[model samples]
Target: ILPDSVDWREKGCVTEVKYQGSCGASWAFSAVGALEAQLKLKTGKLVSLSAQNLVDCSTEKYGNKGCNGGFMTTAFQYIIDNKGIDSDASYPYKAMDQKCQYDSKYRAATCSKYTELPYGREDVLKEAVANKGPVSVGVDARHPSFFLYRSGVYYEPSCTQNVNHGVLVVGYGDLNGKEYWLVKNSWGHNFGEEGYIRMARNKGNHCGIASFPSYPEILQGGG
Candidate 1:
């Protein structure tokens, strides 16, 4: 119920998250991801984040509501403006509209930038890189491997479907004898080995992990 803004692993705990599929519910990912991170930071333990909880909770509307569509940035702004969303006890997940549920008041999580963009991405990274928190971003995974990214690099002109969705920048590092930012995905451990992706550093598409950059209001804001 509280967003404990700290690193949990340093304190000694573990957490796991599962991908909710092509439901276009990045909002749920952001909210749940942040919540899980915060929980770990405070309690020093890993929390099994609930994707279904967010699917059924958030008030932001989409075409199908439960498993329809929504924006993480918009949803974060919604929570920030409204003060945040309740836990799974109050709201729940649908896992692709299995049993459709609705609640227009279940806003979740906080977003620093609630409005559209017109700011420096470098500045945002500089402002928050010091703190190890989840950074939401978009990527141009128009590579062949990206669509069928099974632990290798290749190029995909375009995926069988649009692969643009929400992702958490857990941390940055190097790969393939090159520098890269390790991206954490929700697709489960089986795929990409524990729901993860990789992107290049200081490169477009962040090398295919970060497309949209974000930051706190103090760093920059929508005007």
Candidate 2:
């Protein structure tokens, strides 16, 4: 029942592209972005969640290394344990490590649980994006071509299975006969297609795009 093409941005489920600066906090952005979309889907209210909240609070105990690196699964767990996450306007993004300043009054969204899709299953990933809103995924963004990616279906045969970066898969579609996953990145609007990348899909999981796809389960009336 998936559509031939799906774009969450077109459906007003996505927020503006954000910049992660020099921090390796794409994991925070990915987790928060997916949660934001889910919040919107559940409440029809589009509110930007704080990546910095995860960056500063989801410390070593939660398996995140502040700006050094992190995993979306742990980030979601942090949100669930904390009961909710703060808004971007309240917590703000420092793009650097800072003391945890989370306040419950500023909480904007909550996740009761989360689900991780099967590894290497692009079919399941597509279904999630089509029906569950945005999904957080890991990608091997070490290739130089990926850094310089501008447009069209991005494919790098030499890319390895080393998933180093986090991003959100907003939708999937076919472009010029090539099936692609429409991804939203955290490197700001200047990167890729205005902070989005159309990665080659069904191409043996290019860039490990389908390796660790996951999403938060938003709690209704909890935000």
Candidate 3:
């Protein structure tokens, strides 16, 4: 069984929070967060991989829509196909749709494999994070409650299984009588409890978070 609580941030596996801005590039941030965690585990150092890199380059091959929303699985496939990704400092986030600037020199990190957890299996997801580090997840962030979410465990009854925003599940535990997954959002540090949301957990997987999750494996190539 997984631990009653796990926090990747405190454990030194999580990266600094990021902002997706007005763009729908949450999937890129989510994917890059998971990649950063796994890379930290494998390389003993945290490498800030570029979401904008994925946002721009993963379109033609992986069907990612750049700032227009995307899928973590597709992002992973794009990284695998390209054999790596770049550092955020090298590529920087524009928060806008742009043309691809693919270059091997900008490459910074890579993973040999990426695994997607079972659909709607919170148990499996908990175990995956416990054993493998943080996992990339999607949620119903289009809700107004999500937009204004400030504190306490986030549980929007109006929230549905339809996931429009992707985030990283950095931990899970009980908080204020609510079982919640510590999620890392891409809306900067000023939003939602310091760019993190304690999303209600074990409540029908809460906003399709456990519906589709993935994480990177291994780390090599580039800086």
lDDT of 1 by residue, 39-114 (tens): 4554454545445644654543532254575555655554455455554544544456444243436433333443
Lowest lDDT sum, 10 consecutive residues, model 1, at: 1-10
Which structure among the candidates has the greatest TM-score? Answer: 2
Best by lDDT: 2
**After aligning candidate 1 to the native by TM-score, how far in Å is the CA of 150 from where it should be?**
3.1
lDDT winner, 1 or 3: 3
Alpha-carbon TM-score of each model against the true structure? 0.64, 0.97, 0.94
Across 1-223, the per-residue lDDT of candidate 3 in tens digits comes to 6688999988788878897888989999999999898878877888788999999989966877888888998899888888889899889899997787767797878768789888889989999989889999988877899889999999999888778889999999999678999999988999888899999989997898998899888745557
lDDT value for model 2 = 0.93
Model 1 alpha-carbon miss at residue 122, Å: 5.4
Output the better candidate (2/3) by TM-score. 2
Error of 2 at 205 (Å): 1.0
After aligning candidate 1 to the native by TM-score, how far in Å is the CA of 55 from where it should be?
Answer: 2.9
Instruction: Encode model 2's per-residue lDDT on 36-137: one tens digit a residue.
Output: 998888889998999999999999878899899999999999999999899999999999999999999999999999999999999999899988889999
Location of the lowest summed lDDT over 10 successive residues in candidate 3: 214-223
Query: Which residue ranges in model 2 land beyond 4 Å of their true spot?
Result: 220-223
